[PDB]
Design a binder for this molecule. Structure first.
Ligand SMILES: NC[C@@H](NC(=O)c1ccc(-c2ccc(Cl)c(F)c2)[nH]1)c1ncc(CO)s1
Lengths: 412, 556
């Protein structure tokens, strides 16, 4: 029941991040939520001798209609002393990505029973803002561990084991992983039988309470990585062959032995674009050979946990989106395609925002760390609306893409 | 005596790794020194300060100015080096309330808490760094020592420590007086109700006594200044507000401390006066970094400052904000990258107005400008009213749909409706997605020579039409564009164009409708006249027909 000493890193102050404007209903809802968390001792008012701040805002989580309190702990997390004291942090389970199914369970609800180190609470400062800057902002600090802080799982780490040693020993088939305030639970089981072993853990997390009710169902074994394919036609126009040679030329940056000499030859001259060109046998050969090369994966594409993960997203239209994760250009560690039906249809930014969430989930599962996104959106449009659609309790980093790539077609 | 509730103390430290101030008291004239002991003697008589002994080693200078137009001396501690050693405070200073966001309340009182500042105690452990010396006459005695026991004038923490103190005291009165509103900005207390002025002036007394119970002194008699106030550059009336009148300075030659007190005095006007523009006066600045340099006024500006002496002539007032009714925002394209907006709830009655200027980009188009203004008005509305206005926008719904469905970036604007008041924002051209059957195919190419800067640009086509034009003082990027321009210039209403210029695709795929490059502008005007254009890209140096038998033509 005693706190665990936490420091920042030397030469770093606490976070002093501005709170951005919130709508009236989101302020109204944070006020009630923070008024219960005050009564429950989870937070306490603070005074102006506290210089620190961390933005806060309000959401609804999936298939629930109750405002939830989200705290963007990104900047504190950069400044927080990574916890390599006893253990060097929970290693990533390479087995979690190889599982027929993975369910994500919100265990943040447990964090609020652990006290936080009184020296450190000054650093979790946040502010409910007022409309129009009329009344000053309502300031609180955290007493318990904060949902969204990277220290909260690190510190619950040991204590989360003594809840899960019964279960891990009971089902040594399962892999169970924790990132932030989420529990990732993977089994090779049948899906009906995988759901049962989950509800097994919902009740086993109620027993510990005495001394968090729904299921998000990934399938890392109902997805893989994505080859570059070439069209298959009986007749080709000049345009068809120009797009081909373009795509092969781009793919040659990735796969070395790709050749376009005999297809290019057909593009000699200046025929009309919609004109059918017969393929030379040299060119049919060169195309078949390229198709070969593109069935192998890339050689020497190794993850390196000392470098950053980058995520690029392209808008393909009609609710379809593509993405690539990598560390070094052309050495993709995963690629993918996200698709519509999901409050999409008429709001690109909700699509993009959901797409950023799925990729970051897939990214936790594969490496236990979030990538830096390159978004195909104006900074100003994105910063205005992304919180209106966010549902997850973590937040990745992002920058913004302002030049339309040619590559959209190639990934198409 | 009825006892005063004591005001709880805010702990204050120095900054990590800092001593306290150790600065000499300046030599003061003789009469100045007489005024300070006079001031400090009554202050010590009031519990505000207190003499200190020969231990306290910290010292802050103190001056005395004459309160001009008065024989009363004004004292003044100069806390600069103390502030430099004081910790940082939480700062609620971020935001000055905007008049348009105030609700219309029937009765309104403002009270200046210029005093109670000195009633708010100071952290005992921090009193001893507020020490100062009243130097003596002829330096023939020690200076009279002193430290502060309440929040000291012009100190780092005083406005923050006062504000929090004040809010604590105000919570329970508000909570149990929900039939009134109380805002809290500056050292000023805003109070307001829809109660009739008898029960309004009632609760104004009640709060006066509630403030007594802690030690806070309120202007009992009628405050000399009563609504309407001219406040912080505005004029706040019981049914309306406007900007405090501000005429524009006149100059035969405008320096830079002039055009900045003119684009500043004009950015202020535009928040209620609709249609203010400031472009041909802001170009004369960002291309200049000298606070006394002179620039004559451009030909386009001296008709513009005659427009800003033409809006600022009749009174325009804003109204107050009524939560029951919908918020509307309306935008108008004002030309040359400027946008003007009116936020209102009822026709003709503006809450507030404003402008938007394009970002200093290289190419641009009307829709991304309209989109960017919506996002500004949206953040600005969230700030002032706590909600997003419904938009009425000079763009057809069909145009917006073509744009965002085909735009390579994700984009979005909130709920809006078409207002048919020109100039309408439109799509000037649209590229085909497939090649055009029956359209002539122009394989284009360009190249220059980096040293001689010379180059060529042209096309060859499928019907044998060719052209190569020589060019002087040009670049690879310039000739790649020129090649495309030539092909548009000599083609029919429908045209397929092959280039290898990744530079060109990138410009055209951003779909500008206006450009800094006048070459790009002409391509744009050529595109506007065509019926269909398919722009295809092929990679270079593959001797890709068009771009071989014209790569071998333009580098020859
Ligand atoms: N008694 C006058 C006193 N206050 C005002 O003039 C005044 C006018 C309007 C407001 C106001 C409006 C909205 C909000 Cl939300 C608010 F918190 C305050 N304040 C002083 N102003 C400048 C002084 C320098 O000597 S003194």
């Amino acid at each position: 029941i005693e706190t665990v000493p936490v420091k920042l890193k030397p030469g770093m102050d606490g976070p002093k991040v501005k709170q951005w404007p919130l709508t009236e209903e989101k302020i109204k809802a944070l006020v009630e939520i923070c008024t219960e968390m005050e009564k429950e001792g989870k937070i306490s008012k603070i005074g102006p001798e506290n210089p620190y701040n961390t933005p806060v805002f309000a959401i609804k989580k999936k298939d629930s209609t109750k405002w939830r309190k989200l705290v963007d702990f990104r900047e504190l997390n950069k400044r927080t002393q990574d916890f390599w004291e006893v253990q060097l942090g929970i290693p990533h389970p390479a087995g979690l990505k190889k599982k027929k199914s993975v369910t994500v369970l919100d265990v943040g609800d447990a964090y609020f029973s652990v006290p936080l180190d009184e020296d450190f609470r000054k650093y979790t400062a946040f502010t409910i803002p007022s409309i129009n800057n009329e009344t000053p902002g309502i300031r609180y600090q955290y007493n318990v561990l904060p949902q969204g802080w990277k220290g909260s799982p690190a510190i619950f780490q040991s204590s989360m084991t003594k809840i899960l040693e019964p279960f891990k020993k009971q089902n040594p088939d399962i892999v169970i992983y924790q990132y932030m305030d989420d529990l990732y639970v993977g089994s090779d089981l049948e899906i009906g039988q995988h759901r049962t072993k989950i509800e097994e853990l919902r009740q086993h997390l109620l027993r510990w309470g005495l001394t968090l009710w729904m299921g998000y169902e990934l399938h890392p074994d109902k997805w893989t990585v994505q080859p570059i394919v070439l069209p298959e036609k009986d007749s080709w126009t000049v345009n068809d062959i120009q797009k081909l040679v373009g795509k092969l030329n781009w793919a040659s940056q990735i796969y070395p032995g790709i050749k376009v000499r005999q297809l290019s030859k057909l593009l000699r001259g200046t025929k009309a674009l919609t004109e059918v060109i017969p393929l030379t046998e040299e060119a049919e050969l060169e195309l078949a050979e390229n198709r070969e090369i593109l069935k192998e994966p890339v050689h020497g594409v190794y993850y390196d946990p000392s470098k950053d993960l980058i995520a690029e997203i392209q808008k393909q239209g009609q609710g379809q989106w593509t993405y690539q994760i990598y560390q070094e250009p052309f050495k993709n560690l995963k690629t993918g395609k996200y698709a519509r039906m999901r409050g999409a249809h008429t709001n690109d930014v909700k699509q993009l925002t959901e797409a950023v969430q799925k990729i970051t989930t897939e990214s936790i599962v594969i490496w236990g760390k979030t990538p830096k996104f390159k978004l195909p959106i104006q900074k100003e449009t994105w910063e205005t609306w992304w919180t209106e659609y966010w549902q997850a309790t973590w937040i990745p980093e992002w920058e913004f893409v302002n030049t339309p790539p040619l590559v959209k077609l190639w990934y198409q | 005596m009825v006892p005063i509730s004591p005001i709880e103390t805010v702990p204050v430290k120095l900054k990590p790794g800092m001593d306290g101030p150790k600065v000499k008291q300046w030599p003061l004239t003789e009469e100045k020194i007489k005024a300070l002991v006079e001031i400090c003697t009554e202050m010590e008589k009031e519990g505000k300060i207190s003499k200190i002994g020969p231990e306290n080693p910290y010292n802050t200078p103190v001056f005395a100015i004459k309160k001009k137009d008065s024989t009363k001396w004004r004292k003044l501690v100069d806390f600069r080096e103390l502030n430099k050693r004081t910790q940082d405070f939480w700062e609620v200073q971020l935001g000055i309330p905007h008049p348009a966001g105030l609700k219309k309340k029937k009765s309104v009182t403002v009270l200046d808490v210029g005093d109670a500042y000195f009633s708010v105690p100071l952290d005992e452990d921090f009193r001893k760094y507020t020490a100062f010396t009243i130097p003596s006459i002829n330096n023939e005695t020690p200076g009279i020592r002193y430290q502060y026991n309440v929040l000291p004038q012009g100190w780092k923490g005083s406005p923050a420590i006062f504000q929090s103190s004040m809010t604590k005291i105000l919570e329970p009165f508000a909570a149990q007086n929900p039939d009134i509103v109380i805002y809290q900005y500056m050292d000023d207390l805003y109070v307001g109700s829809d109660l009739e002025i008898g029960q309004h002036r009632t609760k104004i007394e009640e709060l006066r006594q509630h403030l007594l119970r802690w030690g806070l002194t309120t202007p009992d008699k009628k405050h000399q200044k009563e609504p309407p106030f001219l406040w912080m550059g505005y004029e706040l009336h019981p049914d309306k507000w406007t900007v405090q009148p501000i005429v524009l300075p006149e100059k035969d030659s405008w320096t830079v401390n002039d055009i900045q007190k003119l684009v500043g005095k004009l950015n202020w006007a535009s928040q209620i006066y609709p249609g203010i523009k400031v472009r041909q006066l802001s170009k004369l600045l960002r291309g200049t970094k000298a606070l006394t340099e002179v620039i004559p006024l451009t030909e386009e500006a001296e008709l513009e400052l005659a427009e800003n002496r033409e809006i600022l002539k009749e009174p325009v007032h804003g109204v107050y904000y009524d939560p029951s009714k919908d918020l509307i925002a309306e935008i108008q394209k004002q030309g040359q990258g400027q946008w003007t907006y009116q936020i209102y709830q009822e026709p003709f009655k503006n809450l507030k107005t404003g402008k938007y200027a394009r970002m200093r980009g290289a190419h641009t188009n009307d829709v991304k400008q309209l989109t960017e203004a919506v996002q500004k008005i949206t953040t600005e509305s969230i700030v002032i009213w706590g909600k997003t206005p419904k938009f009425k926008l000079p763009i057809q719904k069909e145009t917006w749909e073509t744009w965002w469905t085909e735009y390579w970036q994700a984009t979005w604007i909130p709920e809006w409706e078409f207002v048919n008041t020109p100039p309408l924002v439109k799509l000037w051209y649209q590229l085909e997605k497939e090649p055009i059957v029956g359209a002539e195919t122009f394989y284009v190419d360009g190249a220059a020579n980096r040293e001689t800067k010379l180059g060529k640009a042209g096309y060859v086509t499928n019907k044998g039409r060719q052209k190569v034009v020589p060019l002087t003082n040009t670049t690879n990027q310039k000739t790649e564009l020129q090649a495309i321009y030539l092909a548009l210039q000599d083609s029919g209403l429908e045209v397929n164009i092959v280039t290898d210029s990744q530079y060109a695709l990138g410009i055209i795929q951003a779909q500008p409708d206006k450009s800094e490059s006048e070459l790009v502008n002409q391509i744009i005007e050529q595109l506007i006249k065509k019926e269909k254009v398919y722009l295809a890209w092929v990679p270079a140096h593959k001797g890709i027909g068009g771009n071989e038998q014209v790569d071998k033509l333009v580098s020859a």
